[model samples]
Structure formats: structure tokens, C-alpha cells
Target: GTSVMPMLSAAFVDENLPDGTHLQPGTKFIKHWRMKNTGNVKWSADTKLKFMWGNLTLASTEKKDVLVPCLKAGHVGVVSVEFIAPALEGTYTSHWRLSHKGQQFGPRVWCSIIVDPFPSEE
Candidate 1:
């Protein structure tokens, strides 16, 4: 193996976000997931950077410029996303990923908040 770490590595999520966290359906919540380059060498790619939300609405979607060129080693990059949770409730799941320079980092690392139907709906 090389002495220096690779250019990039798969990202990570909370690892565990249990169901029923109370988000109040039909509402808006701005959530953010952090990305860090824990390797020895910095991570850099071409001019193409992309992000996605598997099930969320994807409101402003402002997080492409934060980690350009490369993320300094030991630095953290925050990816913020805004979405309106679905009104209907019956166990919903959301996921996200990162891509760039034709190299996809990960389709992992996801987080979610529950949206409880106004008591009566439950």
C-alpha cells in the first residue's frame, strides 16, 4: 500500500437514525450532513461536482462550492439541504450521495427525521 492516503474515500452518515423522530409532516426542515477528508492527502477532482437526495424535495441545494479543488486534510465540508417532508406518513426513508469528475464517492450516509401526522391522523 502507498504511504500517503488515497485521494478520496467513501463518505459516512449518522449510521443510525431510528424511525419516528417527529418532524411534523408537510413542514420544512433544513438538515445538513458533514463530509471530512480524514486521509493524509487532500481530495481533488475535476470541475464537476454533484449531490443528490434520494427521496427529499431538494430545495436550494447549496453545497457544490464548499469542497472544490480539494478538501484540505483534516478539514470538514458541510452539505446543507432543505426539503419539505411528504404529507402522508407510513414509514419514509431518505438518502443522499456525492459525485465528481466521473468518480462517485458514495451512495451511503443518510439521515432522516420523522413526520408525525397530527395525532388524529395516527
Candidate 2:
């Protein structure tokens, strides 16, 4: 007999710095996303948090780690990334996803922020 199994997957739990949060131009901040491993496989240290698309300049680089060495099925993991706000006033977003062994899986998360307009001189 043959058996089928579930593939890699995760569920978005919570996030910090709510969407559209306002930030002063050129500000530096860290964005965190909580996710639960809802798949049948374990996520090893090799798993990576990769930048998929969107305003590419927000982060210093396009790749990050999942912040843990291993996460088993039905467990939770948190991924954090450092970002720099754009110099101009506007909204920016960065899309990210998890990948293992070059295969992307799980939910596609993002961080969105609105840069505050420059202060007016008195």
C-alpha cells in the first residue's frame, strides 16, 4: 500500500508594526511575523526567509533567516527583518516568503509602512 503525506506549510499568527504604520523618513525598524508550522515536515536551519517582491529598497538585503534552528510540525516560529524607511514620503511594502532547499512554501507575508511627509519649517 502507498501513503500520501502533507507538504511544507505554515500559518500566519501575528505581526508587529501594523500595516500602514507611519514612520519618519530614513527611520530604521524591525518587522516581526509569527507563524505556525502547520505542515507534516520539520523546518530546518536551511529554511530561508526570502524577499519575493515589492519596494525592494526597504531592507538592506533581500534574504533573512527564520530565527530558529528547527521548527517541527504544529509548532510556532517567528521571523524578523530589519528595514530602513525610504527617504521620500510615501508608502512602501516588501513581500516575503519561506523557502527550503530552493523551494518556496508557506504563506507570503509582507511589511507595509507609510513614510511621514517632511516636517514644515516654521
Candidate 3:
């Protein structure tokens, strides 16, 4: 038996932050994400997008939730979320995924933001 599923919707945008970059704790960053229902089936119910990073919960701890209503079969929706450079200084990754009906996905669409050591008292 096959389960009803929505297309694997995915999209991403990079911010000013660069890999191996450095930022002090509490630094804020914002990026906008646009997802489109590039599927053949008609979208009747709202789809959901979830984000995760390391051990942090992007949903509850961060933006919480993102939804696109009545996306039709080829409609697009946009969402924006803000993040603060974690206090830790190492490497951080921010992963995102989308799920609808019985479908689930999370691949190259996810991205990461690295922060170098803050201005040390050297």
C-alpha cells in the first residue's frame, strides 16, 4: 500500500555569515526561506517546515514553526527566521526539513554557519 504524500519541497538562502567566520556571542542573524509546492498533486492542507541545529531545537527554541497554506500545486511561500551566534566557539550547523502528509525530507537543503573565536584579549 502507498501512503499519501506531498512533494519534497526544498529551498535555502545564505546569509552574510561565512564559513570559518567569527562572531561574538549574542550576535544576531536573519535569513529568509522560500518554499514552493513543486509537486504534481494539489496542495489542500498547509505544509510544515522544521529546523534543527546541533542539539538546539529551532522549532521551540527558535522560530518555532513555519507553515504555508493552500499552496495549490505550484505556489510558493516565504518565511524568515532569526538566529543568534551561539556562545560556543567551534562549528555550528543549522539543518532544515519539510514534511507534509506522509512525506519527510532533509538533505543538502540544510545549511550551517560557522563562527570563529571572538576578539580575544590578545
Candidate 4:
């Protein structure tokens, strides 16, 4: 039996909220991560940016599941999620990765923020 190769690799570029982005508790914002496909496969429409389990729950839900459009090999793409800062005031982080066909593969991307007790409602 031989094997069909699956070229799946990536580079975690950067996030819209850079490291140390300060925010107040329960703040809502969309966080985006830039990714580069370094392999020979195109990320299909069904491909998703999924939360790979983290200590933080900054998203609306426990998991961040965002569908990404077709991304050709050697191309760059943005994966984003709507996030709400946790109720408690503390530094938090959430990590995500690419997934397809029930399999997850790609570089890990994450967002970190310094949280305060005050809300930025203004």
C-alpha cells in the first residue's frame, strides 16, 4: 500500500490585535490572524479556522469555527473571529489553527490581550 501525500503547512503571520493589546472586560471586537500557506494544497471553502483548545474563552462560544475561502498554495489569507473579553480582568489568550475534512493542520495562531475591569463602552 502506498500513500497519497497531503501537503499541509503554514506560517502564522500576525494578528490584527498585536501582542499586549489592552481591552476592558466584555469588550467585543473582531480579531484577525494573517496566515501564509506554505504547502502545495489550496484551502478549500470548507476549510476552517478552528480553536484548538485553549485556556481562554474570549470568543462568543467555547470554540472559534470560521470558514475560510479558497486559498491557493503559497498564498496569504486572513482568518478572523468575533471575540468578547472575559468577564474577569486578566490577561487572556486564544489559539486557533486550520482544519479540513475532519483533520486539523497548520501553524498555530493566537491572540493575546491585557484585560482591565473597566469596559470600553464609549
Best by TM-score: 2
Q: Name the runs in model 2 displaced over 4 angstroms.
A: 4-6, 56-59, 62-69
Candidate 4: the clashing residue pairs are: none
Candidate 3 lDDT, 1-122, residue by residue in tens = 88866455544433344444555665676545556656655454544555544532143344343434555656665545556777676666666666557466433334356656668687
What number of clashing residue pairs does each candidate have, in the order they appear? 1, 0, 3, 0
For candidate 2, give the lDDT: 0.81
Residue 74 of model 4, lDDT score: 92
Compose the digit string of candidate 4's lDDT tens values, residues 29-95. Answer: 8878888887788888657777776555555553453546577999988887777888888888878
> TM-score for each prediction?
0.61, 0.86, 0.59, 0.78
- Encode model 1's per-residue lDDT on 13-122: one tens digit a residue: 33333444666678776555666655455655542235445554544454522234366767776655565778776455556556546666644545466667766744
Residue 23, candidate 3: C-alpha displacement in angstroms = 3.3
